[PDB]
Design a protein around this nucleic acid. Structure first.
Length: 579
DNA sequence: GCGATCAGCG
DNA sequence: ACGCTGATCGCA
C-alpha cells in the first residue's frame, strides 16, 4: 500500500544530506546479528534496499560514516552495534526517536516506532510484535511485508522528528537529547561492542567448588528438616519451616507463609536450619546466575560477554544491563566477590581500572535541598552516617556507638528513597512510633532537607511531574489519589526520583567528558561498564598513573554543585583486584 | 506464558 | 523503603 522504490542498487538520490534511516535487526540480541533490511526516506522519496546490496556498495558505506549526512533513526545504538560487527561506522545520527520518546515520558514504555508514533496520534505504522511475533516465534517475514514495514517506520520517523523536537524544546529537554543521551548512545555502543573478557577456566573451577559446598549444605538441610524437599521452592520451604518444624510466623501473608530474607534473618535464633538455608540460597544464586548463566552468554571464540545497555527503560534515567546483567555482579559477600576474578583485561599487560563516586545521592540531596548542616558535613568531608548519628541521638563523635551509626545509616537511605515511619520501622525492626521519633529528630537537625521534601511533594502536585538537574522528567499522576498507599508511593517517587535521576545525569555527563579527554590524550584506555555511580575501564598498565589523575578529575568536574563530588579509584589484574 | 518469590547489584 | 535483571516455581 505505501509507495516506495524496492531498489536493486544504491543511487545518488538515496544519499541526500538528510534522511530517516532504518537499519533493521530483528534478533532481540543485536550482537553479531543479521541486518535483514534497510529503508531510507528523504526529500526525494521512500526506498527499501537489500543489505547484501547496500552494505557492499562503497558509496552507501561512505554515506553511513559521513557525519555531515544527518540521519533520523529509532534505537541508533541497535544499528550502530550491528554495523560495528561488520566493520562499518554509522555517523551523523542527529535525532533518535526512541531517546526522544523516553525523555518526554519514560512511563509509556516505548520500545517500537508504533508506540512512539501513538504519542502524536500517527497510526500509519504496524507494531514490530505484530509483524515479527515475540521472543521464540519471532521470525523475519517475506520481503513485501518486511519492505513495507521498514518503509512505514522510516516515513514515521521522517514525520515525527519536528513534533518530538518542538515538545522537547517546550520541556527544556532539547539539550538533554542532543548533548547528553544521543552522544551517550554512541559511547554505550563502543562499550557493548568492546565487551569484557571472561576467564572461563576461573568460572568452571569456582563452579566445581560451589557444587561441593552446595552438596554439603543441601545434605545438612535434609538432616535438619528430617525429610527431602525443593529448597528453591519458597512454597515447599514454608511447609517445612512453619508446619513441620513449627517455627513462629512473625508476619502474616495472603498465600500462606513468607520465607523472604528479612523473615529468615529474624527466624535464625529459633533453628539451626535457617542460616544453612540462607547459605544454600547464597551459593545457589552464584552457581545458577554467575557461573552457568554467565558461561552460556560468553562468545566461545573471544571469551567476551557483550551486555546490552537499555538507555530507555528506567523511570529515573539510570541505564539497565541485560544478557548478561553486568551492573549486578557480586561484591557484598567474599565468596560472591570472587566471581569478579573471572573479569580480566581483553589484552596482555592491560589492567582493570574502577572509579566510583562516594555518596553521590546524599551529595545531590545536599545541593538540591540547600541544607546548611548537610553542605557543611560534606565541606568537612565528615563521615556522614556518624554526623547523622551525632545530630539525631544528640552525642559528640566519640560517643557514637556502631549501633547508632548503623541506625543513622538506615535513616540516610530512608531519606533518599523517600522516608516513611512504616519504611524505617520495617528496615530497622522497630515500632512506627520509634521510627517517627528518629525521622522527627532527623528533620530538626536537617531543616533544609525537611523544607525540600515538603516543597518537592507540593511541586509534583502543582506541575504534575518532578525534574532532575539536567531536566529529565517523571509524571506522578498518583500524587492526587485518595488511596493512602497509592498516593504515598508517589510522594516517595517525588522525593527519590530527582536524587537518583540527578546522580544518573552526572555520571552520564562524566562518560561524555571522559571520552573527549581520552581522545585528546589519545590514550588506549576505554570504558567497559557503568554501574550507576561507578565507571570501569581497561587500559595498558603504562596508563594507570595518567588515569589515577584523569578519570577522577573528570568525574569530579562533570557538574558544579554547592558540595564537592568525591571519587575513589582502584586498579588491578582482575575486576576483583580493582578494590 | 506469566505472576510471584527469591537472589544479585547501586 | 527507591531503581533495576535472572533463575525458578507452580498454576494455567
Amino acid at each position: 500500500k505505501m509507495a516506495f522504490t524496492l531498489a536493486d542498487r544504491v543511487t545518488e538520490e538515496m544519499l541526500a544530506d538528510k534522511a530517516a534511516l532504518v537499519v533493521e535487526v530483528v534478533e532481540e540480541n543485536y550482537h553479531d546479528a543479521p541486518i535483514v533490511g534497510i529503508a531510507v526516506v528523504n526529500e526525494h522519496g521512500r526506498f527499501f534496499l537489500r543489505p547484501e546490496t547496500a552494505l557492499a556498495d562503497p558509496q552507501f558505506v561512505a554515506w553511513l560514516g559521513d557525519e555531515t549526512k544527518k540521519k533520523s533513526m529509532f534505537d541508533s545504538k541497535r544499528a550502530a552495534v550491528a554495523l560495528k560487527w561488520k566493520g562499518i561506522e554509522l555517523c551523523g545520527v542527529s535525532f533518535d526517536l526512541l531517546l526522544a520518546a523516553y525523555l518526554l515520558d519514560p512511563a509509556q514504555g516505548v520500545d517500537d516506532v508504533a508506540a512512539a508514533a501513538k504519542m502524536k496520534q500517527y497510526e500509519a505504522v504496524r507494531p514490530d510484535e505484530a509483524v515479527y511475533g515475540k521472543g521464540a516465534k519471532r521470525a523475519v517475514p517475506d520481503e513485501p511485508v518486511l519492505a513495507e514495514h521498514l518503509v512505514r517506520k522510516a516515513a514515521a520517523i521522517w514525520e515525527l522528528e519536528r513534533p518530538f523536537l518542538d515538545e522537547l524544546r517546550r520541556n527544556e529537554q532539547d539539550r538533554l537529547l542532543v548533548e547528553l543521551e544521543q552522544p551517550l548512545s554512541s559511547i554505550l555502543a563502543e562499550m557493548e561492542f568492546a565487551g569484557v573478557k571472561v576467564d572461563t577456566k576461573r568460572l568452571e573451577q569456582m563452579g566445581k567448588e560451589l557444587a561441593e559446598q552446595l552438596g554439603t549444605v543441601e545434605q545438612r538441610i535434609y538432616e535438619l528438616a528430617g525429610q527431602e524437599f525443593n529448597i528453591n521452592s519458597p512454597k515447599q520451604l514454608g511447609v517445612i519451616l512453619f508446619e513441620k518444624l513449627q517455627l513462629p510466623v512473625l508476619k502474616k501473608t495472603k498465600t500462606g507463609y513468607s520465607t523472604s530474607a528479612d523473615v529468615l534473618e529474624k527466624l535464625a535464633p529459633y533453628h539451626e536450619i535457617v542460616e544453612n538455608i540462607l547459605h544454600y540460597r547464597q551459593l545457589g544464586k552464584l552457581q545458577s546466575t554467575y557461573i552457568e548463566g554467565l558461561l552460556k552468554v560468553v562468545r566461545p571464540d573471544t571469551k567476551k560477554v557483550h551486555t546490552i545497555f537499555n538507555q530507555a527503560l528506567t523511570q529515573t534515567g539510570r541505564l539497565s544491563s541485560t544478557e548478561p546483567n553486568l551492573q549486578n555482579i557480586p561484591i557484598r559477600l567474599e565468596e560472591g566477590r570472587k566471581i569478579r576474578q573471572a573479569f580480566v583485561p581483553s589484552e596482555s599487560d592491560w589492567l582493570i581500572f574502577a572509579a566510583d563516586y562516594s555518596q553521590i545521592e546524599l551529595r545531590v540531596l545536599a545541593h538540591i535541598a540547600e541544607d546548611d548542616n548537610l553542605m557543611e558535613a560534606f565541606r568537612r568531608d565528615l563521615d556522614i552516617h556518624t554526623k547523622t548519628a551525632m545530630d539525631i541521638f544528640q552525642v559528640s563523635e566519640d560517643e557514637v556507638t556502631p549501633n547508632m551509626r548503623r541506625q543513622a545509616k538506615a535513616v540516610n537511605f530512608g531519606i533518599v528513597y523517600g522516608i516513611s515511619d512504616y519504611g524505617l520501622a520495617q528496615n530497622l525492626n522497630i515500632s512506627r512510633k520509634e521510627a517517627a521519633e528518629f525521622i522527627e529528630r532527623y528533620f530538626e537537625s536537617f531543616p533544609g532537607v525537611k523544607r525540600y521534601m515538603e516543597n518537592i511533594v507540593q511541586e509534583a502536585k502543582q506541575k504534575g511531574y518532578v525534574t532532575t538537574l539536567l531536566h529529565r522528567r517523571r509524571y506522578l499522576p498518583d500524587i492526587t489519589s485518595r488511596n493512602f498507599n497509592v498516593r504515598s508511593f508517589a510522594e516517595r517517587m517525588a522525593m527519590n526520583t530527582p536524587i537518583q535521576g540527578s546522580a544518573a545525569d552526572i555520571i552520564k555527563k562524566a562518560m561524555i567528558d571522559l571520552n573527549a579527554r581520552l581522545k585528546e590524550e589519545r590514550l588506549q584506555a576505554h570504558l567497559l561498564l557503568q554501574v550507576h555511580d561507578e565507571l570501569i575501564l581497561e587500559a595498558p598498565k603504562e596508563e594507570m598513573e595518567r588515569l589515577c589523575r584523569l578519570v577522577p578529575e573528570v568525574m569530579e568536574q562533570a557538574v558544579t554543585l554547592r558540595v564537592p563530588l568525591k571519587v575513589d579509584y582502584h586498579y588491578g589484574s582482575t575486576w576483583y583486584d580493582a578494590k
